Design a protein around this ligand. Structure first.
Ligand SMILES: O=C(NCc1ccccn1)c1ccc(Oc2ccccc2)cc1
Ligand SMILES: CCCCCCCCO[C@H]1O[C@@H](CO)[C@@H](O)[C@H](O)[C@@H]1O
Length: 331
């Protein structure tokens, strides 16, 4: 056990090892810090109320398990995980540490008007990280520019997976019974469109508005999609929405690389069964200059059987404690 010093960052008490100096809030709570062990800037996240409820306890365990499993260049991974506690009894706080990239994609789009090459590299990396995430049978579920950290060389890492409404898949704007991994592809589509235009694709004011804007672009469900709607009332709620014809993306994203438009058409399909997968997208001609089938790795099997179980708070906290102790830092 290293030396743990205390500090106060905005009404919040922070107890971390001495290797972590210069804590600075960046906004659980997160603080930027200097790792005197590597000389690099890191992001330290202190979970709020880790074990306040069963749901909170399970979520804490979930996040720790996820982060400990992710080992990919384009996915946030764990540099360290610690707790001031010295035993299971005092165990009450969880701190996670990872690379601090510099900025998020949201900030990059604000100022800089990205070139086609930029959007190729950026989207390529997101898909490369996604292929890895999806290979572990994990769904991000909330991909958006603020969840994408980028460094000075525009290298990217995906944050907060497996845990605005502008990038959410239409099926997840409805409580459609069990969605697949392509909900993440829909999000990538929305992100790509925005990196290309500099404008939000579907900037809905609220829930209803969001769906209306999506339908104006991709049109109302065709016959083939309708045939798969098991719910009768949901089937009418669809047709009750103004009939919208599918827009030709070429006429929407004027001046964009034709291959970019083609890819967007394959990601922004209303029917999730017809959406391009991450692996397929990586082989699309749009990424010819970045694609390397021998350098787009997949993950080791991820045991997530814990998701189906209902345990007591102390049980979830004990399991979380076990994961903290069993942690082996990167090379
Ligand atoms: O680089 C990040 N964002 C880009 C960024 C914003 C401001 C200054 C420097 N870098 C970042 C990394 C980790 C974060 O939270 C954590 C997630 C998992 C584990 C530990 C922290 C939050 C932001
Ligand atoms: C109705 C218009 C807005 C919602 C369109 C959602 C289209 C979803 O598309 C798909 O979703 C998956 C289930 O989640 C598939 O299994 C379904 O069969 C369906 O094809």
């Amino acid at each position: 056990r290293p030396t743990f010093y205390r500090q106060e960052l905005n009404k919040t008490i922070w107890e971390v090892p001495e290797r972590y100096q210069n804590l600075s809030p960046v906004g659980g709570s997160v603080c930027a810090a200097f790792d005197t062990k590597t000389g690099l800037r890191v992001a330290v996240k202190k979970l709020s109320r880790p074990f306040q409820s069963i749901i909170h306890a399970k979520r804490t365990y979930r996040e720790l398990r996820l982060l400990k499993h992710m080992k990919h260049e384009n996915v946030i991974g764990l540099l360290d995980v610690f707790t001031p506690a010295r035993s299971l009894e005092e165990f009450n706080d969880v701190y996670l540490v990872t690379h601090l990239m510099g900025a998020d994609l949201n900030n990059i789009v604000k100022c800089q008007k990205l070139t086609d090459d930029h959007v190729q590299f950026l989207i390529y990396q997101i898909l490369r990280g996604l292929k890895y995430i999806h290979s572990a049978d994990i769904i991000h579920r909330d991909l958006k520019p603020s969840n994408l950290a980028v460094n000075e060389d525009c290298e990217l890492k995906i944050l907060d997976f497996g845990l605005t409404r502008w990038y959410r898949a239409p099926e997840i704007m409805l409580n459609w019974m069990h969605y697949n991994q392509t909900v993440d592809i829909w999000s990538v589509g929305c992100i790509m469109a925005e990196l290309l235009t500099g404008r939000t694709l579907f900037p809905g004011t609220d829930h209803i508005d969001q769906l209306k804007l999506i339908l104006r672009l991709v049109g109302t469900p065709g016959a083939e999609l309708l045939k798969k709607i098991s719910s009768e009332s949901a089937r009418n709620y669809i047709q009750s929405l103004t009939q919208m014809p599918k827009m030709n993306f070429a006429n929407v994203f004027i001046g964009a690389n034709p291959l970019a438009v083609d890819l967007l058409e394959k990601m922004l399909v209303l029917d999730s069964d017809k959406r391009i997968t991450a692996a397929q997208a990586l082989a699309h001609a749009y990424f010819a200059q970045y694609h390397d089938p021998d350098d787009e790795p997949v993950a080791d099997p991820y045991d997530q059987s814990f998701e189906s179980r209902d345990l007591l708070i102390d049980e979830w906290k004990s399991l979380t404690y076990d994961e903290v102790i069993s942690f082996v830092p990167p090379p």
